[PDB]
Every structure is written in C-alpha cells, then in structure tokens.
Amino acid sequence: TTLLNPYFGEFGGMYVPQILMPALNQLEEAFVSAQKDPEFQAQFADLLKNYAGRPTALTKCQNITAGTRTTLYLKREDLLHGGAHKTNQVLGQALLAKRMGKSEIIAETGAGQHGVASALASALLGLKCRIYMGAKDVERQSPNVFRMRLMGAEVIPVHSGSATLKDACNEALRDWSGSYETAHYMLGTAAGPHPYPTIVREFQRMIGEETKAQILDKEGRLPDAVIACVGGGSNAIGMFADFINDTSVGLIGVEPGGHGIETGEHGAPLKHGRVGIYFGMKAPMMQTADGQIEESYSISAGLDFPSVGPQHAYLNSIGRADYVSITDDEALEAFKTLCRHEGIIPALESSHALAHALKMMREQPEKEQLLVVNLSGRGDKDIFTVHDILKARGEI
Amino acid sequence: TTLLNPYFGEFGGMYVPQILMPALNQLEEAFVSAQKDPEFQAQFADLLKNYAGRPTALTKCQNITAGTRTTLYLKREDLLHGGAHKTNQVLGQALLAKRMGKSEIIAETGAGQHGVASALASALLGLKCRIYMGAKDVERQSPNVFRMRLMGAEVIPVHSGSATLKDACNEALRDWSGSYETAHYMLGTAAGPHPYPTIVREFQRMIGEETKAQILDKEGRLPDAVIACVGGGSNAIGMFADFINDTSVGLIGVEPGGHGIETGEHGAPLKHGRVGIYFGMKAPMMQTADGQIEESYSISAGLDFPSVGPQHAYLNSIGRADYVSITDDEALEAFKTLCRHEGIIPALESSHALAHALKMMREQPEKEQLLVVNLSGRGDKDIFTVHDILKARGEI
Amino acid sequence: MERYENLFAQLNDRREGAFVPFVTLGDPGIEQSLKIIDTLIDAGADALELGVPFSDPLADGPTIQNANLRAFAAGVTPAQCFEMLALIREKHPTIPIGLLMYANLVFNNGIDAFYARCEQVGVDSVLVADVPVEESAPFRQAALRHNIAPIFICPPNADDDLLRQVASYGRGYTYLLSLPLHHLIEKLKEYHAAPALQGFGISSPEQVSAAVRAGAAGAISGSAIVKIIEKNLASPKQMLAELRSFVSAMKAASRA
Amino acid sequence: MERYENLFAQLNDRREGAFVPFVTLGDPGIEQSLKIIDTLIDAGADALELGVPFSDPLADGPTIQNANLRAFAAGVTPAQCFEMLALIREKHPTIPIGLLMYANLVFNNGIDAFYARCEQVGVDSVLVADVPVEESAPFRQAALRHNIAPIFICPPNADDDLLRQVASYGRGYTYLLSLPLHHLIEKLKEYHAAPALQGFGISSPEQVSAAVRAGAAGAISGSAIVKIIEKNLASPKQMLAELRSFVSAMKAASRA
Numbered sequence A, B: 001t002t003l004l005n006p007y008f009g010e011f012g013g014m015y016v017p018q019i020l021m022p023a024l025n026q027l028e029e030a031f032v033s034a035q036k037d038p039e040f041q042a043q044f045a046d047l048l049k050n051y052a053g054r055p056t057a058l059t060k061c062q063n064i065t066a067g068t069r070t071t072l073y074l075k076r077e078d079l080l081h082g083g084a085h086k087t088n089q090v091l092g093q094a095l096l097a098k099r100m101g102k103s104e105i106i107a108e109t110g111a112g113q114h115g116v117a118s119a120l121a122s123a124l125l126g127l128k129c130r131i132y133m134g135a136k137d138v139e140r141q142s143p144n145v146f147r148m149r150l151m152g153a154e155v156i157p158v159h160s161g162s163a164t165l166k167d168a169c170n171e172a173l174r175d176w177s178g179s180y181e182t183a184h185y186m187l188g189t190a191a192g193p194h195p196y197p198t199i200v201r202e203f204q205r206m207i208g209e210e211t212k213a214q215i216l217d218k219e220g221r222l223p224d225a226v227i228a229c230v231g232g233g234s235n236a237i238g239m240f241a242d243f244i245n246d247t248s249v250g251l252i253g254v255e256p257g258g259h260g261i262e263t264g265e266h267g268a269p270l271k272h273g274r275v276g277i278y279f280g281m282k283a284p285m286m287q288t289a290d291g292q293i294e295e296s297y298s299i300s301a302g303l304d305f306p307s308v309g310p311q312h313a314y315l316n317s318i319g320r321a322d323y324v325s326i327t328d329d330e331a332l333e334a335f336k337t338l339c340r341h342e343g344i345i346p347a348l349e350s351s352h353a354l355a356h357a358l359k360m361m362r363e364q365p366e367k368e369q370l371l372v373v374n375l376s377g378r379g380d381k382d383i384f385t386v387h388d389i390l391k392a393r394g395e396i
Numbered sequence C, D: 001m002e003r004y005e006n007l008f009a010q011l012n013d014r015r016e017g018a019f020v021p022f023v024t025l026g027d028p029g030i031e032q033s034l035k036i037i038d039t040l041i042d043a044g045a046d047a048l049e050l051g052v053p054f055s056d057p058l059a060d061g062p063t064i065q066n067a068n069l070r071a072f073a074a075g076v077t078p079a080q081c082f083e084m085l086a087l088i089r090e091k092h093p094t095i096p097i098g099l100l101m102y103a104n105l106v107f108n109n110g111i112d113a114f115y116a117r118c119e120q121v122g123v124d125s126v127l128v129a130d131v132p133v134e135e136s137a138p139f140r141q142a143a144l145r146h147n148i149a150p151i152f153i154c155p156p157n158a159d160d161d162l163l164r165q166v167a168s169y170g171r172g173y174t175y176l177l178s179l180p181l182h183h184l185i186e187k188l189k190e191y192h193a194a195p196a197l198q199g200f201g202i203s204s205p206e207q208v209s210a211a212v213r214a215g216a217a218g219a220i221s222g223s224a225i226v227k228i229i230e231k232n233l234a235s236p237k238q239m240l241a242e243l244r245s246f247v248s249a250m251k252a253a254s255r256a
C-alpha cells in the first residue's frame, strides 16, 4: 500500500528487496506530510533564497541568435550555490531527513557533483554525511573528492561490480537497509524507486515555475519550447513540471549521444536503450542483450547515469515530451560558442541542451521561435577536459 | 581642470604622463554624464540583474557562531556570475566604453580573475578584448588564461620589470596612451589615477546598498560592522560606500598579513607600507627604502596588489574606517571552517575577511554584535592551493 | 514446488531440519562449479539455492558480490547457467533446486518465458531478490503457471500484513531473515505459510540446530559456502574437501 | 637652468641645433656607463638626458625598459646614480645635464630634498615622466628653488591651454613629442616657452635636420643611443666606437 501512485504509466515502481520497503514507505509519508506543512515549505523557501540564491536569472542571449528569428533565454541554474541545479533538491531532502528525526545522510555520486551537493547541504544543516563513489570515479574526480572532504563528508570508494556510479547506487542502498532508522538516503536524480522520482521533481520544480513567471514578465507569453539535458532526469523534470499542463509548450529532453548513437558509445537509453528493471525501477536501461546493466558513455561525466527517470519515459510514451540526442562534438561546439559569444562557461552537461537549441535555430533560421534552455550548471569544472580535446585535435 | 576632485584628502591624484591626461579627462566626463543618464543606469541594472544575477543573497551563518553573541551574515558575491564581485564593475566600465564609442578593451590582471571578468564582459557586449598579464602570472594561472582565451580575449604576457601584476599595470597604460580613441582601459580595482577609484566604487556600491536593505529587512537595524578584504580596495569600498554616512556602522578592511607583518612578507601597505607615487596615484605602497616598488605577498594571489586604493587611505586617516591584517594561517583556518560548518567554499581572499570576523567573535564571545562579511568570491579556484598546504603540513 | 513438499514431508517423518547451501553458478568456473555442487549434494545438502551472476546484486553482501565477479571473470552468462541447471537436474532427480535471481534477468526476455525455461530445466523455486511482495504479482503468477514456487523473504522488519501476504502468496518455503523469532515462526504457521528456512547468519552447526529448535523447517547458509570457495581458489581439491567437511557438519546439526 | 640659457644663446649665434642623447645611468654597469657618457660628450653631445633606473618606467618603451633591467642586474641604485652625476659634472663644467625621473624617486625622501641634491651634484633640469602639468606644482616649485629647470612634455595631443601652461611653467627646454608640428613650435615661441627640443623618433641624421628646419632648437634621441648599447654588450670597445660614430653623425646634422 502506498499513498501515491508509484508508477508513471508502466514505468517506475518500487523494485527493492523487502527489507527496504519500510524505508520507502516512511519517506513517502514524510514527503506527503511535508508538502502540506507550511512550516516545512517556509524553511525550504528560506534555504533556497538566502543560502542558495533563488530566484536564478533568466538571461536573454542576443549575440548567439543574431540574424535569426530565434529568441533564446537561458535559465541560470549555473548561478545557484554549488554551480548546478542539484543544490535545490538536496536542501529539500535534507529537510525531509530532519523531519523524520534522522541525523545522518547517505549519498551516491558519479562525477561527484551530487556528492558535493549532498556534502554542502549536510554541512549547513548539521547532518553527518557519507558518500559512496565508484573507485574508478574517485580516481578521476580528485577535485570533487577534496571538496566533499573539506565539507566534512566521509567519502567511501566502492570496488564491487564495475566500480562506477551504478555500483555506488547499489552500495548506498545496502547501507540504508541497515541504517534507515537514523540515516536518510539522499538519491541524486529523479529516478530510483518511488517515492524518489516524485520527490526530486517536486524539489526541482521551482526551476520551471520561475521560468514561467520570468518569461511572462519579459515576453508576455509562454515559450515555444523548453530544452534540458537528461542524465537521470532531475534538471529536465524540474524545468518541465510546471509546463506539463501548458500543452502548447514543447518539452525537449536531450540525452548524450557520445561518439554517435550508431557507435553504441552513448548515454541515450530513453531513445536507444531497452526497458529493464534496475535501481528500484522499471525504465529504459543501457544493458547487454542478455540483461546485464551497462555504462552510459558521454564526454560529460554528469550525463553518465545508465538509466533515465520513469516520468521521462512516460512523458515520451504519451507524446507530451520529445527526446533527442546530442553528440560529444556538438556539445563541445555549443560550449565554445557560449563562452565566446555570451561570456558564460556552461557545464558540458548543459552544453548538450544548448547544442540542440542551436540546431533548432540554425536548421530553420527564419522560423520565429521563443526557446528556453535550462543551463543546469557552470563549466569551470570542465575546462581541463575541453583543453585536452582541443590540444589533441590540434586546435591548441 | 577636472569635473570631480581627483583626491581623497592628500591621497589619489592623476600621476600619469601628459599624453594620458586627455584619456582620463574623456573618461571622467563620460562617467559624470552616465551617472545622470537614466538610460545608462537602466542598461547597467539590466545586465546586473539578468546577466550577473543581482541581487546576491545575504546568508545568516548559524553553525559558525553557535554559542556566542555574534550574529554573522555573509554577503554572497561568491554567487555572482564569474564567482566574484569583479563582475559588477567590469559590466559598468564596458558600458562606459560603449558610451564613448569604443570597440576595444584593454585590461591588466594578476591572479587572472580580473582578466576573466574583463573577457566575459567584453564577450557579452561584443567588444574586442586584450589582457596584459605578467609572464610569471601567466605560467602559474593556466586555468584563468584558458578561460580568457575561451571567451575570445587575447592574452599578452608581459616580460618587463618583475613580470608580475604591477608590470602588466604599466603595459596596459602604455597601450592605452596610443589607442585610447578606440580602446578603453578597464582597470581592475578602486585604485590608479582619477577617475578610476571613483568609478570603481560607484560601480560596486550595489554591494553595500543591497546589504543595507537586506539587514534592515532581516534584523530591523544596521550592522555593528561590515568587514571586507582589501587587495586593491574594490570589494571593500563597494561594501562600505553606502554606510559611510551611517557613522555607527564600523567599516573594517582586512589586508593580507602573509607570513606575518614582522617577516616583511605580507601585502599590507595601508598599515605597514609607506606613501609613495605609482600607478597614477599617491597612496601607501610596498616599496624599498630607496623607493623601488615591491611585491605584495599573500597565500591569496588576489590580494597581491602592492598598493591600495586612495579612498581607503583617506578613510583610515580620518578614522572613519579601521584596517587590520590576517595571516595566511588565519585565512586558511577560516576557509576550512566555512567549508565544514556552512557548506560554502570561500575564496582565500574573502577568507581573510571571514577570519577577522571569527576573531572578533572568538576574542569576545559574550559581546553582542551584528556583523556582515563581504564574501567577495568563491574558492573552487583555491582548492589545489589549499590541498598542497594541507598535505605539506601532514594534515593529508 | 512439489519437490519441496516431498522433502519437508520426508524430513518431518525423521524429525529432521533441512540444510540448504547457496552458491553462485559458475563460480569460480563452470566445471569447478558443477563439481562444487555435486560435492554439496553428496555431503548432505537437502536442497540448493543457486545464484545467476548479475551485474548489480543489490540484496547481496561482499562475499557474494565477489563470487559474481569471479563468475564474470570466467565469462559465465545466464544461458550457460541454464545449461548447468539442466545438467544438475539430470544428475539428481529429487533434490529441490531454487534460484536466486534479480528482476532484470527475469524480465529481460519476458517474465513468462523465464519461468517456462525454469520449468524446462527442472528448477523448483525462484526468489527474485529485488521484487517485494507489493510488486510480485506477474512474477508469482508466471511461477505458479510453470509449477515453480515463488519464494518470499520475511525480513527482520516484517509486520502482520506482510506475514499474511508472504503466507498467502509464497510456496515451497518462506525465506526467513532474522517481532521475536519464535513469534514470526509461530505466526507464519498460523497463517499456513510455506515452511520457514532461516537464512540469516547461518555459518556454524549451532545455528542450524538453533533454527530447528526455534520451530523453523531448516536453515540456509547464504554465504558461508562461498567463503570456502573464495579461500581455496588455488587448490580445487582442498576446496572440495573443505566444502564436504562443512556441509557434512552443518547437515549433522539438523538431524534428530 | 642657466646652462641651457647659455647653450641656446651660443648655438643661436652659430645658427646651430642642439643634439641631446638619452642614456640610463649605470647601464650596463657604473664604469661602462661613465665611459659611454664621456664618449657621447666627446663625440659632440650638446646636452645630456640621464635616466635613473626605476622599477616601473611607465613612460618608457621596450628599449629603455631593458636598459633599466640591465642597470638593476648591475645593482645600480639612485644613490649610486647621484655619485655618478657628481663625477660627470666635475669633469664637464658647461654641458647641461637633465634627469629623467619617476615621481616616486623624487617624492621618496622628500621632494624638496631631491631637488636640493640635484643642485648639489650639478644637475640643470628634471623631467618627471609621470607628473602632468596639472600635478606639477610642488615639483616645479622645488626645482626653481634649487635653480633646476622643470621640463615638461608637449605631447601629440596637446591643446592651446596646455601650450600656455607648458610655456609659462617650463624652463630650460620644452620636450616636444610629435595641431601640426610647425604650429606647435610657432605657438610655443609666441607664448615665450623654453626652446623646443624634438624628442619623437630621433634615430637618424635626417630627423635632426628636419627638427631644426621646423623651427625647433634641437633634437633628443630618446632611445637610439640605448639601442647601440644593447646591441654591443659583448664588446665595450666596439660599443664606444659605434656610439662615437652615431653621435658624431647626429651632431653634424644640426650644424649650419
């Protein structure tokens, strides 16, 4: 029995060992209660405004669209404390942990952004934080590991399976099954078993609500489309949620195409994977023919989640949202273009969304369209990655 | 003849070769005109809000003051686009360049933050940007150099004198003396020849204006003191300006004490240097006994300007503002403390201001005081520096 | 499921508990795994629990995580595991064989088709480790259509509603993971549950006898057998000796 | 300043321009610098402009930036430069000696004290390169109290107000850096300015004659002399030969 539907159509559910079902039920009840509690909402709004810096700007980018009939706005989640949208929902989930009388946080991380976001939220709110990270990820994300430790978090390398993100995902769940009376599992995207896809959407939906109010103020109408990159689905569902019922507004999610869909080296399960059951949910997966879970590949480590949130799979199935892919080279071009023409260094994750908007513009330059890209994060973190590619291509 | 007084008491002036006086006079006239022009003010406000993200949060930090009678707020310039307060005034000066019909920007940089800020402003506003940087600075600031080049700026290493910041300062002035009909010199702090100390203050004073409105809303009274680090003086004068006439509000500027004032390895000219004439101004300088200009030393490259803005020297002389120093070790402690207890990674520059506020609290923990620290920037940039010290101390 | 019904009836007549070891199929390789399994049987295993290597064994601790890795290092696939299962059944007509599966391996090519292949090769039960009772309907329906017992875990944090659900929906045995112990066992009997096998921490003979004394039908050694494999990789001969020794001792502890 | 008055009167009687080379004191070392300076005089310099090495020569191009660096590499200090100046004056009674200074070196130990030491060692003029006329008052007042001519630059971007200020406040000579050229020179004369020396780009004999033809009192070679030093560091003997050759040619170009 649950209070809320655990499925979006056929996608979603609660595919966890029995021992974890009380933990999920507890969390669902606390969430439902919190959502009706004005004191909780006021505390959440206070942290979002005065600690994280909401509302975030909506920037009109003129140079990049000059001479076309595209008007492009960027929703500036890159300006949020922490430098990415992840901060919004970790603050919400930390408050949920407190609501449930918990003093400890468990989190998983791949690229390390969610580890950093969990560690910052935990430091602010006086929670003891432990972060699981695939041993391979630990080795290649030294800056993020150090940030987590500076913030007082314990970072625990995971050596099982492929020693990457999906493996940390498993290990976080294993710890929680023993510790859930005192610890909250702070899941890092809008995926996993119910109630996480719902919670993460509702704790990110201020992105779309603000976007709507800002575009109405600035342009006097809704956007033709809002465009967001899709790793696990959190920034995209946060942008999309408030517009779902505005049926004239296109919802475009962009998965990483990596070296090209046809190469198989990509991270686009929603459009090019196969539905499976893993990490507590029924959803499109990167998997082998015989059902072993595989890794997502992208230039952007942040888009490597090998599955996608169930609500995206559902919105796609009914035709409410459209999903596309952008390759590493396309994302790299968009990254350089924004730096040079607007003086904003975008996360390589966000650069996938921008690349698709630039394609919409360039393919049909006399089409009048009002687009918003969710600029999910800033790209300081990516400059060595970009440097290395540019040198190797002999762009020097 | 000038429109405005070029001096703050005995400090300041216009100590440039004759050839540069028309350039300064032109800039002063354009500034005075701009300050009366509602269209200019509206354009500036638009960029500040919708591109840079103003207003910035004022965060109450509870964990760090728990059990004392200090209430501490941080003004979150770390959340501004670019990750430091420098962005405010580069946007103002870029608009001044346009007002004067200029299409090109010249800037100097030491640590590289001002180069990056100049390059971003120039990219947004379609100005061709060239940045002078001491060759030694180029070598040790590879990430910032790459950011400038990504944003389309030309970065020019300077090999004269000591090949550092003061040398880039000279070289920027040398270029401008030939190119001022088409190029604007975007000076990076509240120092140099008039009218720069005035312009930079007025294009940073939104920091203090916002702080005042935010503290009145939150606490119903003005702060006991506002506290800011002092490299050249821009973030500090931006915080201070709106409070100058509120004579109950303490204005505390913190210079870098480096390894300790008594070692001579510091960057505290206002309190421990000697008045001299250099970089177009009469002001306290780091200099040898026979009058050669010397370097500032600090753990934080951003506080290495070897002089200080003339308005600070003036406010100190009349007793309106008090200036203190904080050593590298004190700043490092404040850096670790904020990370662990509030989940904010502060710039090592800003960590000097925070360290002094923590000393005010710890020295007199039962003194009731309402303090604001200007958190001038974020400290992602500093994590390798901090890592290296911690390893070398065997903190691992 | 009939093989469990027959086993428990036979054990009950002998006032005897069941001892059930777990191993990962194909750990440390297909040939050695087949030898390991025949050794467990000869040494006195009453039933087998057999895992199919999976990339993400959520319900599993370090010991079994590492067994999965060994099997993958040996290139073991689900298809190879099903060939092994058919051979195991062909050698041993009455021993109940249960699989420990993860949901994606069951769903991958169709849930019904999965249970049909289980029936073809002679499997008696399936426990799907990441399917709670709330999600179990298509799995238990397919199992029963193919004469396979659906096995459910009764966890430490069970409640009355869960006991009644596990009791109603399960067949073959109830997988007990340690309300007090004697109370769970008594309540499961009251609700006419499949006979309980204790699966928590069964690493020594005294724990087998304790399980039977508590009222359970027997005990499952979830990881101790795999630990003996892990410890003895360099000597297959010694590995088999130590497995035989261990299973013999554990089975003795079940006997009246 | 009297030495300039006497020089110009003497040159005027000979219908002759002044040729004035610049060098950095102590470049490439104190001893060689003294030899360089005596060579310039023997070769026909009418007056000298001498720079004191400073950490931050704002008004200076690459050639002189590098001369400063050489002098610093040789450990040259302002005190050593003043000792050099006293020796130069002791050797040569009538040649006008002008310094090119930066403000901090003048202000460092007191502006008045600076000009008093200039007078003691026999200096005739001081140009402070980073002090515009608008800031000049304490510098020109101290200069005149110590019988030192304050030298001002008339830049390409001069205006009428500046011409009148430079004309009123300057003594010794007006430093012209190329309103048209002939117009500036004529206007400075109209305003009774100190005689003009052209200081822009004087690198060849034809530019010296052109300066005189334009109505100027002479020409200053701001950097060409230093370039000959830079080019010949490895051979002091050749350095002196080439300096003598160059200054001889440049001076010849000034003669009626």
Ligand SMILES: *Cc1c(COP(=O)(O)O)cnc(C)c1O
Binding pocket: A083, A084, A085, A086, A113, A114, A188, A189, A190, A229, A230, A231, A232, A233, A234, A235, A236, A302, A303, A347, A349, A350, A376, A377, A378
């Ligand atoms: C984590 C991250 C993403 C991808 O995660 P979603 O859950 O799909 O939003 C995208 N952009 C940035 C900047 C991120 O940090």
Ligand SMILES: *Cc1c(COP(=O)(O)O)cnc(C)c1O
Binding pocket: B083, B084, B085, B086, B113, B114, B188, B189, B190, B229, B230, B231, B232, B233, B234, B235, B236, B302, B303, B347, B349, B350, B376, B377, B378
């Ligand atoms: C540049 C910088 C400073 C020092 O410059 P001021 O002009 O003294 O403000 C301080 N903090 C940060 C974060 C900076 O980037």
Ligand SMILES: [Cl-]
Binding pocket: A108, A109, A110, A111, A112, A113, A114, A115, A188
């Ligand atoms: Cl992450």
Ligand SMILES: [Cl-]
Binding pocket: A142, A143, A146, B383, B384, B387
């Ligand atoms: Cl590091």
Ligand SMILES: [Cl-]
Binding pocket: A149, A150
């Ligand atoms: Cl640490």
Ligand SMILES: [Cl-]
Binding pocket: A217, A218
């Ligand atoms: Cl409006």
Ligand SMILES: [Cl-]
Binding pocket: A269, A270, A271, A272, A273, A274, A275, A284
């Ligand atoms: Cl699919």
Ligand SMILES: [Cl-]
Binding pocket: B108, B109, B110, B111, B112, B113, B114, B115, B188
């Ligand atoms: Cl800088």
Ligand SMILES: [Cl-]
Binding pocket: A383, A384, A387, B142, B143, B146
């Ligand atoms: Cl780099």
Ligand SMILES: [Cl-]
Binding pocket: B149, B150
């Ligand atoms: Cl580049």
Ligand SMILES: [Cl-]
Binding pocket: B217, B218
């Ligand atoms: Cl209020």
Ligand SMILES: [Cl-]
Binding pocket: B269, B270, B271, B272, B273, B274, B275, B284
């Ligand atoms: Cl002083």
Ligand SMILES: [Cl-]
Binding pocket: C212, C213
């Ligand atoms: Cl019994």
Ligand SMILES: [Cl-]
Binding pocket: C252, C253, C254, C255, C256
């Ligand atoms: Cl016995």
Ligand SMILES: [Cl-]
Binding pocket: D212, D213
């Ligand atoms: Cl003539």
Ligand SMILES: [Cl-]
Binding pocket: D252, D253, D254, D255, D256
């Ligand atoms: Cl001749």
